[PDB]
Design a protein around this ligand. Sequence first.
Ligand code: X1Z
Ligand code: X1Z
Lengths: 304, 305
Amino acid sequence: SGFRKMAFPSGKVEGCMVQVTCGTTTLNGLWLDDVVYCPRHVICTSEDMLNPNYEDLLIRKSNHNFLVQAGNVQLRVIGHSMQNCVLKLKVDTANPKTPKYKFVRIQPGQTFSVLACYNGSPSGVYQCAMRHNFTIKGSFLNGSCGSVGFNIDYDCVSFCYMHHMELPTGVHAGTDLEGNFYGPFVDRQTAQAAGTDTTITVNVLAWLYAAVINGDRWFLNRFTTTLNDFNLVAMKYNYEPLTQDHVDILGPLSAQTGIAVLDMCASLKELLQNGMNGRTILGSALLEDEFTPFDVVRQCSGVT
Amino acid sequence: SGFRKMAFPSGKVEGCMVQVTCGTTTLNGLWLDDVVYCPRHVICTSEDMLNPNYEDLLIRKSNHNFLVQAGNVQLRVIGHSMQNCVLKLKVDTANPKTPKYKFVRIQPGQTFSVLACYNGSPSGVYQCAMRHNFTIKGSFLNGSCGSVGFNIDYDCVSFCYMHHMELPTGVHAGTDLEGNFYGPFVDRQTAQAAGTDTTITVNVLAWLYAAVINGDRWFLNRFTTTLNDFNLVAMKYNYEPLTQDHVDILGPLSAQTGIAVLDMCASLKELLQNGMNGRTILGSALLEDEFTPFDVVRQCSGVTF
Ligand SMILES: *[C@@](O)(C(=O)NCc1nccs1)C1(NC(=O)[C@@H](COC)NC(=O)[C@H](NC(=O)C2CCC(F)(F)CC2)C2CCCCC2)CCC1
Ligand SMILES: *[C@@](O)(C(=O)NCc1nccs1)C1(NC(=O)[C@@H](COC)NC(=O)[C@H](NC(=O)C2CCC(F)(F)CC2)C2CCCCC2)CCC1
């Protein structure tokens, strides 16, 4: 038993991290088969990033201008192309450590592991959720752009995030691996700020099921509610509206515990209205919203 | 910026995890060069574990009784011996991806990354602190025994924990890699329970420094205190007594922020006596005590491996 925020083992992604350097700009890249994927702003000086025209800046670059290092070993770039906000550097050597992989665009509320990297080398690994304002609450310093977020399922690594930047509130923004930015953000030093954010209701409910499975059950009230009545309360606390699709993805947890989703909703409604009364749930004094239903299922069942 | 509970990259340890199966008992082992290290109770049936005679149970076993699998490749056992609660299985093939490593015994308050594993396959990675009652608060299911905890210290993987068991309050117990159990615990189904625990004061202070480094300032005050006056308050809240050694290891964080340790102690005193003002610190509504001072330094400076 026990419930912890748990990252995927990072070794499969570690084997793909490289350093990419253009003049005075160094960042991280992702080496899969014979392509290195990295943020396109590697071709910018810091002054270029104030107002870049990427098409023009990339005309000005040759393959030689890209120094790609896998460890201390140089990989020769033999082509370069841009896809939205990502650069794809073709190299002369296919990564022998390439895992089976997919590129996926994730949805608000979904979680993933971040392997935070500097100069192509890993610092550490942690879980993040895509927030509804399309930011994540990570831990990133200068030089971390190009670090990736991912999920692993049995053999397959699904890459879903590539880090780009930090907004002035200290939260983090980036793209999928096709180079499209989550949210209304751009890869330029120009004013942009995170929108308002909601609490991820379906995740809070998943975490309450995690608590029940691990024997933390004081908040269960054995009452029930309707979806409509729950959402009227939840809206007052800036919670995301709960839909029947959310009810369905909680299905495996409702199945395992025998507690109806709407019963858990009644317990959550009372926690919102009354607070926790100096008690904790799974060691927390706030209602945690960065565990998905699948995170709970798979941690509680020991997958892979 | 940002501050997260951050595990070490796990790939160096992943390449060392194997499955060890003896009859009806399967768990995880650690394959370094030509030796696999695993909990000795792999040689026990669940019935044996009620009252095991480990020296007798070991001598009854042959090399053939151990099936060791590294992914899909079987590793033939060519010798076996026992050190405390750890079994060492000599194998015919050396692990070609053995990291530079050390077996270290950690002290209460120190943290490590746990690579949770089942059937020799890693499931996830997360940080744990060794509590003062010598348990850890992890996430472990049946089959997780033999999962290891570790730190990376420059160029060296320092293995410090091998998981054994869960106590009835849901906390977790295990050994170092020499097979000695942290705490007064034994590898047998006999009655044992976690003792009283304290909050790890030096880690709370480190985390408050992490918060200042990341731009929090609301809990800072103009006051300072002494070690003895702080400990009078800490005692009332079941905090570990702050020692001068603790003050010393907080030196680098005090240096970076310019805030003296006993100034930060006066902030912590006010937080304990008056609460957290309905506010969160680094996303927590409680005072977090599972970040060491070096955990703060390594995360805030971007140390890589
Ligand atoms: C890289 O982008 C990087 O490390 N990004 C991720 C970071 N996470 C936390 C801090 S940085 C590189 N950039 C930098 O290290 C950094 C300093 O470069 C000398 N520059 C930036 O991060 C820029 N960011 C911004 O200007 C912010 C300002 C506030 C905002 F809201 F407007 C958003 C942008 C660049 C980020 C990428 C787009 C252009 C500006 C490491 C070399 C690149
Ligand atoms: C292995 O020990 C293991 O997985 N241990 C770690 C666990 N963490 C959370 C749950 S288990 C193996 N054992 C089991 O999976 C498990 C079921 O085996 C059929 N057996 C045990 O965990 C035993 N534990 C106990 O009897 C408890 C009871 C309460 C306590 F406080 F007394 C402590 C021991 C064994 C643990 C190791 C020592 C002997 C008993 C996977 C096959 C081995």
